[PDB]
């Protein structure tokens, strides 16, 4: 026995928006808990969030959470659970005001050019909502939310392990998750964090494409750990490509623009979104608005220039003031990366990878589930997931704008509020032999001994490229087929990949490499899923199957791992709730 151990009644892997909201709640419950992160908590991808948080507060105008349900169910394509969404939308307000009581810098209401109302959180008009239900604090709502939450773990003295890299989960002889292992990026030592509850909140991994809004950190470490451990992933092909990404930059620009009155136009001067969604206009859903512009590029009718085939996001018409008071963060990203002042000229926008709706399947309490021999939902002892890494089945097949953040807090808090109870249920969990622990150290030992292998940059590049072409907005059988094979080619290749730096004091390479494996398992699952599904729903668009299969494909595709052994694909669904809800026509 030579490996160090750190016992906690909980381990929250991830310091994003959800990871902290949970670490906080779990601590309020008098539960000893360790919080881990690859970067300093304030650097997690959440800081980059803009738009805001869509929640029914009723400040901008009277509203009810149910309208939030309809706007969202039809938004997912009846692929998102009514039970979970209900809970979220309903518990929405209370959870958000909670954040304001924590000191979150929300924008305020009262006087404006042609508007007027009390101190409520300012709610902006957003995509997928009949009216304005988006609480926003300037263009930097994520930054406000992430910092507040950190400030909170500062007050409540949460134990934080900053810049630690979680490797793989550690299984119990009875097949339960009992903590995990992690690397101290600073010193390089490896340690086993043993816990009666292991919470994953490692965000998404849009890095498996060549142009994404995500950061260099979103590598799906989470997804990789789940599969290499034995845990499935739901709807892992459902990827929302944001409509207004920046052409050539991949840097994001808020939907709030259209919300404040932004135009999405074509070179011939028409607002093609008005023609596509005849009555909903630019407010049209995520999945829909993407194909609209992307299409205008297929027909050779998309604008072009140094940046590339883009679509003009006209905003200049709005007052320079309004743009500076409501979208300050936008006015800069455009000049900085797009070399264009939105105050006078539109923005070269294009649908780029954004939110990953797929991820570890979980109950509302945040517990992780797997199927039974029969194919029944079986909770995984000692494992929970919250945030983007989790498919609680809320966004379904199309994440409504500003709901992810609302997701983070609600379900992040939900896991916290329920933790003690869940542990009670699973009961006691037995130790792990050095064998179990040793197992998780495999991926590390491999990389550290193999030095004459192959250069990971190529593997990485290839990986993203293939995903980019064969699994873009629009895709088809033949395509997936080739890519799916290419991947196997690369996944074997990756097995002989090398590690040049064998140092201790902050080894960025070693870390990045380790992340590669996750990129690999992640992209893979994405493919086998993408191919599998026989319909064109939400973000999924197949030219071969242009209509949604209500009877066959109205379910959650479950990617079936076996760690590194051969794979499989199954199904799942959730129609029952309290106020009731039927599928329907989806016209935005």
């Amino acid at each position: 026995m030579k490996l160090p151990v750190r016992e906690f009644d909980a381990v929250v892997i991830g310091a994003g928006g959800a990871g902290m909201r949970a670490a906080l709640q779990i601590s309020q419950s008098g539960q000893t808990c360790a919080l881990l992160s690859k970067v300093f908590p304030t650097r997690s991808h959440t800081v980059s969030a803009q738009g805001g948080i869509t929640v029914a507060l009723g400040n901008t105008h009277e509203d009810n959470w149910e309208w939030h349900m309809y706007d969202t169910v039809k938004g997912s394509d009846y692929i998102g659970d009514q039970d979970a969404i209900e809970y979220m939308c309903k518990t929405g307000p209370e959870a958000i005001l909670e954040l304001e009581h924590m000191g979150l810098p929300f924008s305020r209401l009262d006087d404006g050019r042609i508007y007027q109302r009390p101190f409520g959180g300012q709610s902006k008009n957003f995509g997928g909502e009949q009216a304005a239900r988006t609480a926003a604090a300037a263009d930097r709502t994520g930054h406000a939310l992430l910092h507040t939450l950190y400030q909170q773990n500062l007050k409540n003295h949460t134990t934080i392990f900053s810049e630690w890299y979680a490797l793989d989960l550690v299984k119990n002889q009875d097949g339960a998750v009992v903590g995990c292992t992690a690397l101290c990026i600073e010193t390089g030592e490896v340690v086993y964090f043993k816990a009666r509850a292991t919470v994953l909140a490692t965000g998404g991994a849009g890095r498996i494409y060549q142009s994404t809004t995500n950061a260099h950190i979103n590598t799906g470490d989470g997804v990789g750990m789940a599969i290499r451990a034995g845990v499935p992933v739901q709807d892992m092909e459902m990827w929302q490509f944001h409509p207004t990404g920046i052409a050539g930059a991949g840097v994001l620009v808020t939907e709030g623009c259209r919300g404040e009155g932004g135009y999405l136009l074509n070179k011939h001067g028409e607002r093609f979104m008005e023609r596509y969604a005849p009555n909903a206009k630019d407010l049209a859903g995520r999945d829909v608005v993407a194909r609209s512009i992307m299409i205008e590029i297929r027909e050779g009718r998309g604008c072009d220039g140094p940046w590339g085939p883009h679509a003009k996001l006209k905003l200049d018409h709005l007052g320079k003031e309004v743009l500076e008071s409501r979208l300050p963060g936008i006015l800069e990203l455009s000049r900085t990366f797009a070399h264009v002042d939105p105050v006078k000229e539109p923005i070269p926008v294009i649908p780029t990878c954004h939110y990953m709706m797929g991820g570890i399947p979980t109950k509302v309490t945040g517990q992780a589930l797997t199927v039974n021999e029969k194919g029944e939902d079986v909770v995984v002892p000692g494992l929970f997931a919250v945030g983007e890494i989790a498919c609680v089945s809320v966004h379904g097949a199309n994440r409504l704008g500003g709901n992810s953040l609302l997701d983070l807090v609600v379900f992040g808090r939900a896991a916290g509020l329920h933790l003690q109870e869940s542990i009670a249920e699973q009961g006691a969990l037995r130790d792990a032999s050095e064998s179990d622990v040793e197992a998780s150290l495999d991926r590390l030992n491999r990389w550290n001994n193999n030095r004459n292998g192959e250069d990971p940059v190529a593997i990485r590049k290839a990986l993203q490229e293939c995903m980019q072409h064969n699994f873009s907005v629009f895709r088809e059988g033949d395509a997936m087929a080739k890519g799916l094979e290419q991947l196997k080619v690369i996944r074997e290749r990756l097995k002989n990949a090398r590690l040049d730096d064998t140092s201790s004091e902050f080894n960025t390479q070693r870390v990045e490499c380790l992340e590669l494996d996750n990129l690999m398992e992640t992209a893979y699952a994405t493919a086998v899923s993408a191919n599998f599904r026989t319909e064109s729903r939400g973000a999924h668009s197949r030219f071969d199957f242009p209509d949604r299969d209500d009877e066959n494909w109205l379910c959650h595709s479950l990617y079936l791992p076996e760690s590194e052994s051969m794979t499989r694909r199954s199904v799942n669904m959730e129609p029952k709730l309290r106020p009731a809800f039927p599928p329907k026509i989806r016209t935005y």
Binding site: F40, D110, R140, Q152, A215, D501, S504, E505, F506
Partner: protein
């Protein structure tokens, strides 16, 4: 064109003292790229080279580095602003703070000072609001330029006062954050907060050098913030 770089290197287990290593990254003279881009490439040529990066868009605070004598974010410092024919591009770690490896410094002392000033809302709870707190736009306006700090420490790193008293003088970023709560209508411990900053170092080590304003990526002005804190003190202790 070609690009000659000058990069700070140091590894506790190989090196026993720092050194400046030469680098050439022949890039396409097509367009301009950020310094992070260069670095990433160079890292492909040389793995051992370590540094921090993330959001990539000037919003996370990870890539704070001293470029040609001036502190900034590698993710948004164009190679245009740093290229001069015949001369090398000197990239070094943030000044004052200890070096963990290559261009990565221990930010410890920085976060510490941040904590000393109580970076969170303090509301005695007296007079609970029905729902959210009462914050008129005019009151919420007062927080602008004060809540956007991304903790990159470009400012503190550029302050001599902070070099001599890392742990006594709070520094630019921390005072900017102290002020964020001092003028927050929602915070009810202002007078208590002011008593905690009345010593001789916490605030008064600031000589209005304005290097902090000079380098802020976000265009924040700690000097001005510190000037208002000083006033509040005068009002409360005189």
């Amino acid at each position: 064109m070609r690009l000659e770089f000058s990069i700070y290197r140091y590894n506790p287990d190989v090196d026993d003292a720092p050194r400046m290593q030469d680098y050439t990254l022949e890039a396409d003279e097509g367009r301009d790229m950020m310094l992070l881009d260069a670095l990433i490439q160079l890292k492909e040529k040389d793995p051992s080279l370590s540094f921090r990066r993330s959001c990539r868009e000037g919003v996370c605070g990870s890539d704070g580095l001293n470029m040609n004598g001036k502190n900034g974010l590698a993710c948004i410092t164009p190679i245009s602003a740093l290229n001069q024919p015949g001369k090398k591009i000197v990239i070094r770690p943030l000044p004052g703070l200890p070096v963990i490896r290559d261009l990565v410094v221990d930010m410890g002392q920085f976060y510490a000072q941040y904590e000393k000033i109580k970076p969170y809302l303090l509301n005695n709870g007296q007079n609970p609001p029905a729902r959210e707190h009462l914050q008129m736009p005019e009151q919420r306006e007062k927080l602008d330029g004060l809540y956007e700090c991304i903790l990159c420490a470009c400012c503190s790193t550029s302050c001599p006062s902070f070099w001599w008293n890392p742990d006594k003088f709070i520094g630019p970023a921390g005072l900017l954050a102290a002020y964020r709560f001092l003028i927050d209508s929602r915070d009810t411990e202002t007078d208590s907060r002011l008593d905690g900053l009345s010593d001789a170092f916490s605030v008064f080590r600031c000589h209005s050098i304005m290097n902090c304003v000079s380098v802020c990526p976000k265009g924040l002005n700690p000097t001005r913030a510190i000037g208002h804190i000083k006033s509040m003190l005068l009002q409360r202790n005189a």
